[PDB]
Amino acid sequence: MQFVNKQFNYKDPVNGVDIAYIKIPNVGQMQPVKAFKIHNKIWVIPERDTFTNPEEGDLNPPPPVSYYDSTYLSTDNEKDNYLKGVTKLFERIYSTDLGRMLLTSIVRGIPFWGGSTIDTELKVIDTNCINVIQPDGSYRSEELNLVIIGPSADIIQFECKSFGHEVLNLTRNGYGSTQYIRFSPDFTFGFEESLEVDTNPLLGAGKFATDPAVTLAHELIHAGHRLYGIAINPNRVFKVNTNAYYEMSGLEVSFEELRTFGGHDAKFIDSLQENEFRLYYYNKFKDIASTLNKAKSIVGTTASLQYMKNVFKEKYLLSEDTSGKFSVDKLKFDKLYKMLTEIYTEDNFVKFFKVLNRKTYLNFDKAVFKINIVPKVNYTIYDGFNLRNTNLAANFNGQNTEINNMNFTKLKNFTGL
Ligand SMILES: CCCCCNC(=O)C[C@H](CC(=O)NO)c1ccc(Cl)cc1Cl
Ligand SMILES: [Zn+2]
Secondary structure (H helix, E strand, O other): OOOOOOOOOOOOOOOOOOEEEEEOOOOOOOOOEEEEEEEOOEEEEEEEOOOOOOOOOOOOOOOOOOOEOOOOOOOHHHHHHHHHHHHHHHHHHHOOHHHHHHHHHHHHOOOOOEOOOOOOEEEOOHHHEEEEEOOOOOEEEEEOOEEEEEOOOEOOOOEEEOOOOOOOOOOOOOOOOOEEEEOOOOEEEEEOOOHHHHOOOOOOOOOEEOOHHHHHHHHHHHHHHHHOOOOOOOOOEEEOOOOHHHHHOOOEEEHHHHHHHOHHHHHHOOHHHHHHHHHHHHHHHHHHHHHHHHOOEEOOOOOOHHHHHHHHHHHOOOEEOOOOOEEOOHHHHHHHHHHHHHHOOHHHHHHHHOOOOOOOOOOOOOEEEEOOOOOOOOOEOOOEOOOOOOOOOOOOHHHEOOOOHHHOEEEEEOOOO
16 A cells, blocks of 8 residues: 555645645744645645744845755746655655554654643643644644644754754653754765765765655654654764764764664764663653553543543553553563664665765765656656666666766765765
């Protein structure tokens, strides 16, 4: 089966269900934006993100390694191609067993109902919803797990972000929260095939293009961590001392990025600090089990208390004794924690897609390219750029920007800067 069962066009009429104008709660200011529900719990907003951070409302460039284009994603044809590009990447990810596992975990990873001030009841947290304009002009609040949205002013700053909370560190206390991924299918980075070149800031022009399915999978791995409330505080950083150029500029890379890349990178998180993180999150899951056991009713008519207790029993793989009380089993916790942090990694997706990719997160990006993955003559669910039964099938020739030059327009060189 396919992950996105409908092929949306941007101009398809709104229906108030899976094609709708929506607002993001606590932005209020905003005019409704057209949004598309491409799968249970997952929406796409083909708009530049001027909404999730009120200090980031201006796409115009100031007078770094950055890329600005205030006009990108401003027209209907662009939003149509954005929507279709994003859906194609979800299908490419879902066509692998690994991406099928990751996307199943993401859909199951409903943000915890921890918005009550009274431990006698469960209550949704408002900011894990969107407000959907119905056909009768009224708003209905819909819980969701993931929104794909266009980048803000700096086009290259893809990131998985989410609405904070006064008291609760939702992405690190086991609860989770709705994740907003700033992402574009319309650009990709160039990188170098020799490790000594790719990790040197002065060398290489970016001969090979990153497959954007890897880039989206990388962000979805962050989203999985954040939906299960086990992201590592970005303040916890590897003060990189394995690359003389990183050291010269004092570049610090968060453990959350090294975990997400996987492979050799994750080994830069020392065993003692990893063990500390694992214990910390185990304790958060126990807190959720204790909260569920104290819950004696629920706010809302969306679902029953027993129903939602069971949703979170399944999400966190809790055990239930003959009295109905929930508990955290260390064996099942370690299994889920390890799936989300060690099995879902960038390096492992590279193995499934059979693409060329950076060998480490600890490199230097060489260039940014404009691409168009929507035409099947350029890029397919099954092959990405390396189209079978063409000259592009072998040796990653489709990602080779010199051989496949009509599929890539270099917009900026970063090497030197
Ligand atoms: C527009 C062309 C494609 C852009 C790819 N952006 C990304 O991979 C986002 C990534 C941050 C991250 O890992 N978030 O999870 C990043 C951001 C800026 C720079 Cl300098 C280098 C990197 Cl690795
Ligand atoms: Zn990342």
